[PDB]
């Protein structure tokens, strides 16, 4: 059983630089050609760079040519991606992937990608932005006074103006999980993120059961607990 692990992702200002590493266990990386790819939030897969097992052949997507450099160190069983002149649109999860070997006859280094990528890492996240790390503000989405008697009510929390991703949200410290919907974050024009978490509960419980959303934003070491109750 083999393992491939990327590291080095982080937050970068526009124009900055970053170095990603790809380390493997269970096989000799130099026996395989390698690639870097990336996936921007909510978008598809984009190939970025290729390097032959020996390191003598390299190819690049136009989007990164002249800014990124792929390399490898066969003694350290690793592959690397050096990034410079980074731009906001370079924000993505970056994947290192090994190219599959041929079943009988081997593909030379200049065309070593013919048979696809058979082992991928779980990726490392790169965020390019001018925004500063900032914890969220948490506001109640209060259950409506018109909630149907003996029916279903909705309530939630608005988690606004934090950076960078991610935040996590629980309800009643984990005691409330059924009916919870925590939406994917949206990037606002301010460069800060926002999301809402909602839950549906019995209308008859609004008078008796306390509802609290627990928000954790590790990048800013911020934890917030917000009680959501009917507005007086």
């Amino acid at each position: 059983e083999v393992q491939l692990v990327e590291s080095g992702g982080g937050l970068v200002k526009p124009g900055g630089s970053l170095r990603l590493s790809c380390e493997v266990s269970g096989f000799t990386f130099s026996d395989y050609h390698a690639t870097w790819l990336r996936q921007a939030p909510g978008k598809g897969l984009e190939w970025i760079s290729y390097i032959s097992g020996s390191g003598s052949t390299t190819y690049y997507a136009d989007a990164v040519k002249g800014r990124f450099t792929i390399s490898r160190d066969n003694a350290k069983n690793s592959v690397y991606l050096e990034m410079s002149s980074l731009r906001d649109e370079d924000t993505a999860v970056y994947y290192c992937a090994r190219t599959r070997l041929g079943d009988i006859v081997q593909a030379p280094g200049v065309i070593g990608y013919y048979y696809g990528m058979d082992v991928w890492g779980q990726g490392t996240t790169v965020t390019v932005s001018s925004a500063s790390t900032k914890g969220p503000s948490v506001f109640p989405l209060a259950p409506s006074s018109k909630s149907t008697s003996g029916g279903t009510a909705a309530l939630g929390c608005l988690v606004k103006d934090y950076f960078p991703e991610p935040v996590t949200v629980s309800w009643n410290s984990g005691a409330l999980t059924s009916g919870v919907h925590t939406f994917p974050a949206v990037l606002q024009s301010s460069g800060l993120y926002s999301l809402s978490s909602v839950v549906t509960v019995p209308s008859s419980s609004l008078g008796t059961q306390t509802y609290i959303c627990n928000v954790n934003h590790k990048p800013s070491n911020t934890k917030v607990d917000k009680k959501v109750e009917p507005k007086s």
Binding site: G44, W47, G116, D118, G123, F139, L158, F183, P184
Partner: protein, 212 residues
């Protein structure tokens, strides 16, 4: 560069169905066409390489066909773990290029959303901004239209939507629409309304509140 076109972009299916998805290359790529599976938050997995060869460990219900510019992936007898996004990728020349992806989602009966509207909290208004939230809860299919009206005036350009992934237990979707206004703008108007159009609703449903 070689452009890869997958069809359809989204597919609704049930367990046990035989599903086929197509991948067209803008120029000939011989048999150098690979298929990948990806689920949310995880790296893609190679399923088929060189158009029709099954990667070791991949269930035999997956098969691939084609050469040149026309390729197909077939999943015989779809299983719960097969609902995911599938990408084709040509590997005959650089840049390596992928199709836009095909998402296979679980088919279920039409379900209308439960609609809720939330006013901004007094706490937020002290910051000079007001957020108004409209929730569409547990509906199917994914397609829905949400329109904001303030004092019966249609709002444009000042709202953002977010949608959850398909629910694992009831196969529904949920959606939020957030209207963002300045404190001054919010306090200038009285009636705030969210009007929802969906296949499960015979007529659009409106939820509203009066400021104060």
């Amino acid at each position: 560069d070689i452009q890869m076109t997958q069809s359809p972009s989204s597919l609704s299916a049930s367990v046990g169905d035989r599903v086929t998805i197509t991948c067209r290359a803008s120029q000939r790529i011989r048999n150098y066409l690979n298929w990948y599976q990806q689920k949310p938050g995880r790296a893609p997995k190679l399923l088929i390489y060189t158009a029709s060869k099954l990667q070791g460990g991949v269930p035999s219900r997956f098969s691939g066909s084609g050469s040149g510019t026309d390729f197909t992936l077939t999943i015989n007898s779809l299983q719960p773990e097969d609902f995911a996004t599938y990408y084709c990728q040509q590997s005959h020349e650089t840049p390596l290029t992928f199709g836009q992806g095909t998402k296979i989602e679980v088919r279920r009966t039409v379900a209308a959303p439960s609609v809720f509207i939330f006013p901004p909290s007094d706490e937020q208004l002290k910051s000079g901004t007001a957020s108004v939230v409209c929730l569409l809860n547990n509906f199917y299919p994914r397609e829905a239209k949400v329109q904001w009206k303030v004092d019966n005036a249609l709002q444009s350009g000042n709202s953002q939507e977010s949608v959850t992934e398909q629910d694992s237990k009831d196969s529904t979707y949920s959606l939020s629409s957030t209207l963002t206004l300045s404190k001054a703008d919010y306090e200038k108007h009285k009636v705030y309304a969210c009007e929802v159009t969906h296949q499960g609703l015979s007529s659009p449903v409106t939820k509203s509140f009066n400021r104060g």
